[PDB]
Design a protein around this ligand. Structure first.
Ligand SMILES: CC(C)(C)c1cccc(CN[C@H]2CS(=O)(=O)C[C@@H](Cc3ccc4[nH]cc(CC(F)F)c4c3)[C@@H]2O)c1
Length: 377
């Protein structure tokens, strides 16, 4: 019955993917950012310059106050508000209604984006990283506890206005090609995984693989970029620079600040390398890789000119909190968050990213010794 959830995600480039939800009685309709990188369900509950609408608790006969404040600091942006519960539904999702925790956002700083078209966030990760603490049951745990929906969901995030699918409760085989490859969820807090090797245009970076997961690696749909730990970021930019030295770019470009431009249809894709991340597999000494194309880490941005140019931002940026596999890694893959079996699956997406002479891929098996040493402690 998954066909009803196909294409239930909309989004703007660099502004996340959102699904339609309703909260309260009678149902109030809101667009909610889909975020595997956090665990709080929160919605605008008060006027804001960037909100077109918001949650009005007074109008809901089913609203319950929990008489308890809350705040969440993201890497960028944060909000605070009041906890409560209410009835929640997903129109283009499973046919159910659940009572869920809701953080009514009363104040925020750099959380809402100008003209994003969403008014809240749905954190799909585990209770452990919930605020104020792991006793606030996340939305999906409530969904699974109160209904017969199976304990898994999958995300197909499509690039170039963007769309996608959140299949709640299962896998829709019409959304990917090839085989699914699974990597263990290392610990149920973030969707934490272990990267065991990295290659750029087929050349190993040759770092201690702990560096790849320092201090963790997570799969995070709410984050736009691929984010790499300082040491890994520098090695990667150095390698991507060398491969593209044919041309030259401002260095504010490599910092994700300045756009780079080319005459429409003349982007030199061939001079940017593919990036391969190898992930720990399901069996002893076994891994698999996902390969990313430049079309994924060069994010198309709106031209600031009377020009019909193609313009892009570098969508790989530095991190001090570990690797973040954000939307530009997830785009063009079908990603299965198999909570029931503590694993995450990757397959080539039906909306896979296109290149002339190259293709995004999920390939295996590979042999990799001592994958366990790759985890940071
Ligand atoms: C567990 C928690 C305390 C929530 C936490 C703190 C720091 C970092 C993380 C990891 N996950 C984070 C990484 S991030 O802050 O870059 C984006 C964030 C989700 C988020 C929140 C508000 C946002 N506003 C605008 C955006 C951009 C998006 F829409 F493309 C956006 C994204 C993730 O959720 C979690």
């Amino acid at each position: 019955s998954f066909v009803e959830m196909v294409d239930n995600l909309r989004g703007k480039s660099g502004q996340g993917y959102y699904v339609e939800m309703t909260v309260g009685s009678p149902p109030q309709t809101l667009n909610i950012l889909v975020d595997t990188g956090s665990s709080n369900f929160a919605v605008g509950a008060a006027p804001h310059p960037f909100l077109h609408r918001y949650y009005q608790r007074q109008l809901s006969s089913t609203y319950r106050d929990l008489r308890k404040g809350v705040y969440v600091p993201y890497t960028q942006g944060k909000w605070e508000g009041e906890l409560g519960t209410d009835l929640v539904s997903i129109p283009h999702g499973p046919n159910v209604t659940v009572r869920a925790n809701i953080a009514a956002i009363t104040e925020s700083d750099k959380f809402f984006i100008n003209g994003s078209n969403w008014e809240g966030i749905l954190g799909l990760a585990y209770a452990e990283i919930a605020r104020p603490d792991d006793s606030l049951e996340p939305f999906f745990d409530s969904l699974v506890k109160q209904t017969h929906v199976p304990n898994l969901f999958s995300l197909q995030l499509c690039g170039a206005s963007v769309g996608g699918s959140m299949i709640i409760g299962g896998i829709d085989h019409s959304l990917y090609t090839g085989s699914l490859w699974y990597t263990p969820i290392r610990r149920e807090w973030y969707y934490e995984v272990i990267i065991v090797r990295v290659e750029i245009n087929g050349q190993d970076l040759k770092m201690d693989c702990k560096e790849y997961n320092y201090d963790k690696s997570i799969v995070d749909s709410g984050t736009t970029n691929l984010r790499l730990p300082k040491k890994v970021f520098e090695a990667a930019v150095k390698s991507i620079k060398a491969a593209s030295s044919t041309e030259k770019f401002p260095d504010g470009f490599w910092l994700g600040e300045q756009l780079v431009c080319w005459q429409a249809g003349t982007t030199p894709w061939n001079i940017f390398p593919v990036i391969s991340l190898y992930l720990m597999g399901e069996v002893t000494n076994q891994s698999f890789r996902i390969t990313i194309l430049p079309q994924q880490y060069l994010r198309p941005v709106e031209d600031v000119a009377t020009s019909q140019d193609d313009c892009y931002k570098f969508a790989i940026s530095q991190s001090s909190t570990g690797t973040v596999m954000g939307a530009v890694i997830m785009e063009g893959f079908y990603v299965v968050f198999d909570r029931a079996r503590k694993r995450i699956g990757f397959a080539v997406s039906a909306c896979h990213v296109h290149d002339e002479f190259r293709t995004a891929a999920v390939e295996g098996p590979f042999v990799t010794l001592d994958m366990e040493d790759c985890g940071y402690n």
